Structure 1
Amino acid sequence: APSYRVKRMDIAKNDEECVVNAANPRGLPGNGVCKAVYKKWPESFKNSATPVGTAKTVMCGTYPVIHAVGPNFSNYSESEGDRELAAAYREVAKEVTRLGVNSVAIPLLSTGVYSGGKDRLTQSLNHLFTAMDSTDADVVIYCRDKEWEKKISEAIQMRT
């Protein structure tokens, strides 16, 4: 049964068996999480470009980096962007199952610079739950903001 924890730390330092990158469609180092991933796993950006709403895995040895491209809500209506966010997480879940990994480190997609200025914690995390519940991986959610740590912690608590 999939389990969920949250940690307040740089996802580049995760101890899990694979990592999900909050990637962009052009496959660029980007900023934020994406750049942290680039700094730790540069060779994961070989041919990593992939369209909004999809995920593409690039292996670093046997360590998978799952580039998940959520929408930039500055460029999508709320309905269309919510569909692509859901779809990006669903593609991450499918890749986690395919890879057969026991655990996955995962950031909240379409937040920060992709959020259009809006607080999208609950929206993005609920899509994360819905996708990852179809796996049996242990899920570790990474964030940097103390308050977001608290909010994710509570949301986890009140599904069990």
Structure 2
Amino acid sequence: GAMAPSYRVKRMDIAKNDEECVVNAANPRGLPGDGVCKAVYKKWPESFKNSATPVGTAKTVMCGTYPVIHAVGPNFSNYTESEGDRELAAAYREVAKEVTRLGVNSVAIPLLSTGVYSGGKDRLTQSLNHLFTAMDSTDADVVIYCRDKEWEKKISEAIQMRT
């Protein structure tokens, strides 16, 4: 584990992360997709062999020895708010189990269900709160990746408030 487990946020492409493993914001079918998923496909295409997995789950596939944890958040266009909330919390719990199993000291993670699966709603606080609920009991250094300047400030504020 990390000597003093922390949370940090960076505004940049997660395909350029400096962590021991990455979480992909995957679709259930293991397709190249869009947004984070397409960037992950371009950087680690080998990790998409048999990566299909249901909503609310995570499946890790190695690219060389680098682990890519495919985490499938719900598409809020299809789920109700209550069911989508439950599946989003479940996807993050599965990410925590995989990060623990892998023995890594750091992980790069995006906010699941905040892009094209958001159903057109701002889900920063909802998604980040489920990320903290799952990851708080792990000892890996967590680095959250985002692309928007206002989101970077809000995520940074949420991390700092708890310290």
> What range describes the TM-score normalised by the shorter chain of this pair?
over 0.9
The SS at the match of 1:49 is: coil
SS of aligned partner of 1:56: strand
Tell me the alpha carbon deviations over residues 99-154 of structure 1, each in whole angstroms, 9 at most, x when there is no partner: 00000000000011000000000000000011011210000000000000000000
**Residue 60 of structure 1: how far off its partner (Å):** 1.4
1:3 maps to which residue? 6
Q: CA deviation at 1:62?
A: 1.7
Measure, in 2, the Cα distance between the counterparts of 1:94 and 1:3: 18
* 3-state SS of paired residue (1:58): strand
CA–CA separation in structure 2 for the residues paired with 1:126 and 1:102: 21
Rounded Cα–Cα distance in structure 2 between residues aligned with 1:130 and 1:81: 16
> Once the two structures are aligned, what percentage of the paired residues are identical?
99
Q: Over residues 18-75 of structure 1, what are the superposed CA-to-partner deviations in whole Å (9 max), with x where a residue is unaligned?
A: 0000000011000000000000000000000000000000011221000000000000
Deviation (angstroms), 1:2: 3.0
Output the TM-score relative to the length of structure 2.
Answer: 0.97
Q: How far apart are the structure 2 equivalents of 1:2 and 1:85?
A: 23
Asked if 1:112 is matched to 2:112, the reply is no
Partner of 2:39: 36
How far, CA to CA, are the matches of 2:64 and 2:94 in structure 1? 21
Secondary structure at the aligned position of 1:80 is classed as helix
Question: How many positions carry a matched residue from both structures?
Answer: 160
1:81-104 deviations in Å (ceiling 9; x for gaps): 000000000000000000000000
Residues in 2 aligned to 1:93 and 1:9: alpha-carbon distance in whole angstroms: 23
Cα pair 1:2 1:132 within 8 Å, conserved: no
Cα RMSD, aligned residues only: 0.6
Q: Which runs of 4+ in 1 moved over 6 A?
A: none
Structure 2 CA distance for aligned equivalents of residues 100 and 63 of structure 1: 12
Counterpart Cα distance in 1 of 2:6 and 2:33: 30
Secondary structure of 1:142 counterpart? strand
8 A Cα contact 1:10 1:144, kept in partner: yes
The answer to whether the 8 Å contact 1:85/1:127 transfers is yes
SS of corresponding position for 2:8: strand
Structure 2 distance, partners of 1:112, 1:98, is 28
Unpaired runs of 5+ residues, structure 2, are none
* From 56, 61, 65, the counterpart of 1:62: 65
> Contact conserved, 1:53 with 1:68, CA < 8 A, in 2?
yes
